[PDB]
Amino acid sequence: QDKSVPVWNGFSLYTDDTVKAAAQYAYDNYLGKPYTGSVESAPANFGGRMVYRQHHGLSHTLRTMAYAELIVEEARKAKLRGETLGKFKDGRTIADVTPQELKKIMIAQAFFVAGRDDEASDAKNYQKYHEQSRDAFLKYVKDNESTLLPDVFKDQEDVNFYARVIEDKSHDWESTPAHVLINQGHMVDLVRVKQPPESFLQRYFSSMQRWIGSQATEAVFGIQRQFFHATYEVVAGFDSDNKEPHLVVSGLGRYVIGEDGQPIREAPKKGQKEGDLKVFPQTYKLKENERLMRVDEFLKLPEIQNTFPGSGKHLQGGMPGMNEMDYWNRLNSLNRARCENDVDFCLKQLQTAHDKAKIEPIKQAFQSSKGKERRQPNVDEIAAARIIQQILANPDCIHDDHVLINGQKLEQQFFRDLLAKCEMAVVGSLLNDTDIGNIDTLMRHEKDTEFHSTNPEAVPVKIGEYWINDQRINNSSGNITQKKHDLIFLMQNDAWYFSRVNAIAQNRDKGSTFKEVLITTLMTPLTSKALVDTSQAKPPTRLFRGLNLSEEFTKGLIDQANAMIANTTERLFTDHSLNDLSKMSGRTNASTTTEIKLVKETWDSNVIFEMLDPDGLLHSKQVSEFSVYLPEDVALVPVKVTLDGKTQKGENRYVFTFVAVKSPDFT
Ligand SMILES: [Hg+2]
Ligand SMILES: [Hg+2]
Ligand SMILES: [Hg+2]
Ligand SMILES: [Hg+2]
Ligand SMILES: [Hg+2]
Ligand SMILES: [Hg+2]
Ligand SMILES: [Hg+2]
Ligand SMILES: [Hg+2]
Ligand SMILES: [Hg+2]
Numbered sequence: 001q002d003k004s005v006p007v008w009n010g011f012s013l014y015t016d017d018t019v020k021a022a023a024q025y026a027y028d029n030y031l032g033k034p035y036t037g038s039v040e041s042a043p044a045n046f047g048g049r050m051v052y053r054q055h056h057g058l059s060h061t062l063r064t065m066a067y068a069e070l071i072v073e074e075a076r077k078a079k080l081r082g083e084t085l086g087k088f089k090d091g092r093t094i095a096d097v098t099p100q101e102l103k104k105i106m107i108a109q110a111f112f113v114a115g116r117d118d119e120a121s122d123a124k125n126y127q128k129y130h131e132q133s134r135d136a137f138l139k140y141v142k143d144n145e146s147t148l149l150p151d152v153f154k155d156q157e158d159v160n161f162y163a164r165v166i167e168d169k170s171h172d173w174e175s176t177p178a179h180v181l182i183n184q185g186h187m188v189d190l191v192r193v194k195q196p197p198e199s200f201l202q203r204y205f206s207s208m209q210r211w212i213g214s215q216a217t218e219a220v221f222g223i224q225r226q227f228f229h230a231t232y233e234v235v236a237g238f239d240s241d242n243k244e245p246h247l248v249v250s251g252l253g254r255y256v257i258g259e260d261g262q263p264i265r266e267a268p269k270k271g272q273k274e275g276d277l278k279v280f281p282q283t284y285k286l287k288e289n290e291r292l293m294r295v296d297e298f299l300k301l302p303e304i305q306n307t308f309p310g311s312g313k314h315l316q317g318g319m320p321g322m323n324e325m326d327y328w329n330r331l332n333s334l335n336r337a338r339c340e341n342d343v344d345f346c347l348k349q350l351q352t353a354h355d356k357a358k359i360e361p362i363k364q365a366f367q368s369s370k371g372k373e374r375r376q377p378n379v380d381e382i383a384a385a386r387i388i389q390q391i392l393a394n395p396d397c398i399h400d401d402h403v404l405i406n407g408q409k410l411e412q413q414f415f416r417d418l419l420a421k422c423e424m425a426v427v428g429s430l431l432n433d434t435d436i437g438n439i440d441t442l443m444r445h446e447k448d449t450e451f452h453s454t455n456p457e458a459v460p461v462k463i464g465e466y467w468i469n470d471q472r473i474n475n476s477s478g479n480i481t482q483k484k485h486d487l488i489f490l491m492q493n494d495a496w497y498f499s500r501v502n503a504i505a506q507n508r509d510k511g512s513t514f515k516e517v518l519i520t521t522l523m524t525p526l527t528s529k530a531l532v533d534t535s536q537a538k539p540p541t542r543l544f545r546g547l548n549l550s551e552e553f554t555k556g557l558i559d560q561a562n563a564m565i566a567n568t569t570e571r572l573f574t575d576h577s578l579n580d581l582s583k584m585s586g587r588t589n590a591s592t593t594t595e596i597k598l599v600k601e602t603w604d605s606n607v608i609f610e611m612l613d614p615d616g617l618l619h620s621k622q623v624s625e626f627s628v629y630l631p632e633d634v635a636l637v638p639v640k641v642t643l644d645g646k647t648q649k650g651e652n653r654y655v656f657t658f659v660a661v662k663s664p665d666f667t
C-alpha cells in the first residue's frame, strides 16, 4: 500500500470565487425562483421571509458542495492512516481527487437540481428536470466560456462530461469520483427529513463506507449534523430501539417476520450460512402471524451489527444545550431564510462550521485542564447587590442622612457594614449593565450633592453635575462600555473622589457625610465590575510566522503534519482512546505577525506557520511584528497543510495551519 496523498493547493468551496459565482448564478437564475409546477411546491415562510424551494434550494445545493469537500478531506485522511478505500475502475480512489477536479464537480453540483419545476418525484419528471439542470449548467458555461474555458474545464469535452453527470441518464452512469461525489452528497442531504431515520442513515452510511471506510464515514455524518445546525435545518435523532417498521430504502420495501418469529429469507446461496433477506413490496398482503420487521430488529441483525457502527446506539435530536422552544424558534428563524437566499451568508455559515469541526475533535483528544473553581456569592452579597441596584434605579429613595427603600431606614453604619463584610468584587459580579446605566440615574438625582476630598481646604465638588455633564459631552450616545472606562478614569485620576472613597472603604475616614459613604458603597462594586469587564484583553486569534526552509525539510514536515491531521476525526457513534514539527512549531520566536502580506510580499517566506488561537492560550508581545511564548501545557496541533502559490523567485510556498490547545498531557 502507498499512503501518499498529494498536497492540496488551497482550493476550497468557501474561498473560491468561481464556485461562489456559479452558485450565485444558480440562485439568481433558478434556485431562488418560485417553482412553476404544482407538486408540493408552495413557498415556505421562515421568520417572515419566503423560501421558495425549501427542499432543493440554495442551502441544500451548497450543503451538497460542502459534503464533497468534506468527503474528499476524510478520504485523503483515511488513505493517510493506511486504510484501503474503494476503487474506481481506473484504480483511483476518492483520496486521489485533485483540487482541479473537485472544483469542476462543485460547479456541476451548483446546477444539479436547478432544473426542477417542483417536487414531483416520478421518473418522467426526474428526467425532464435533470435535462433542465443540464441545460442550465451548459448555458452557464457558454455565458462564461472566457473565464471558465481553458482554466477550469480543459475543453468542451470536459464540460460535456459534467453536463452528463447532471443529466444522470442511466446509460451515462459510471463509477467515477464526479458521479459518486455528486450522487452521494445529494442523497445524504435527505438525512434531515426522511423517516424512519435509522433506516435511511444505515443505508447512506453503508453506501459511503464502501468508498471511504468507516471512520471517515462517521466523520462525514458527524460533521453533516453541524452543517445542518449551521444552516438552521433539523438535526434528526437516531434510536436503535425504534419500533416502527424498517424501510428498505432502495425499492421502498420491507422485510417480513414469519410465524416462527424470524425474517423471511431467500434460499441460501452456497457458502452462505443464511439466505438473503427477502424484500417485499408495501402492497404485499401480510398473512396472520406475519408482520413487518421493526427498525430495532433490523439493526440487531448480525449482518448489520457486524458492519454498521450505529447498531445499539442513540443520538439525541436537535441541539445540545437548547430548549425545544428555542430550537423550534431557531429553525423557524430569519436565519433559515437568509441561508436559503443569500450565497455569501450561507457559505459563511458552512465555512465557520467546517473550520470549527477541524478543531473540536483536536480538543476532545486530550484532557482539558480543570479551570479554576469559585465560591458562590453568599446570601449577604446577593442582598448587597440587590439593594445597590434598587438604590441606583430609585434614587428618590436617597435623603440627606439615610436611604428609605423597603419600609426600612438605611443609615450610615449600614453601608459601612456592607463595605466591611461583603466582598465587593463578588458584589460587583452580580451587577449588570442596566445598573451601570443607572449611574446616570443616580448622578442626575444627586446633581448638587457635594463630594469632599480628604484635603480639608479642597473645594467640595458636585459629583453628579461632574458626572452628568462629562457624559453628555464625551459619551453622548450613552455607550455603556465607555461608561465603564469613564468610571475607572474617575477612580484613577481625580483625588477629590478617590481619596474619600478609599478612606471610607478602609474605615479610616474623618468628617464623611452620609452621601459620601453611600456613594462610595455604590460605586465601589460598580467600579470593580467595570475593571473586570474592560480588562479582558484578548490575544489575537490568528497569527502568522515566516520561515525559510529547504523544500526537502519542508516535505519532511508535511508527512508529519499529514500524520497528525489524519488521526483526528469527528466521531458519531465510536470514541477516542513529540515530533520535528512539535519542536519547530513550538519554539518561542519573533518573526510573527498578524499581517499575511508581511509574511508573503515583504519577507517572501516559502513556509508559513498559521497559528489559530481561538482560546487565547498563546502569551504574545509586540516587538505588525510580535514574539510568541508557548506555555508548557499548551501545544500547537496541526490542522491543515497546503500549497499557497509561489514566492517571487518561483519556489513552492507552503502554509501549515495549527491550533493552540491546552492540556496537562503535554507537560
Ligand atoms: Hg414541502
Ligand atoms: Hg434526488
Ligand atoms: Hg434512543
Ligand atoms: Hg440501545
Ligand atoms: Hg428626590
Ligand atoms: Hg423609597
Ligand atoms: Hg423619598
Ligand atoms: Hg454585606
Ligand atoms: Hg472644604
Ligand SMILES: [Hg+2]
Pocket: 484, 485, 486, 488, 489, 534
Ligand atoms: Hg479605561
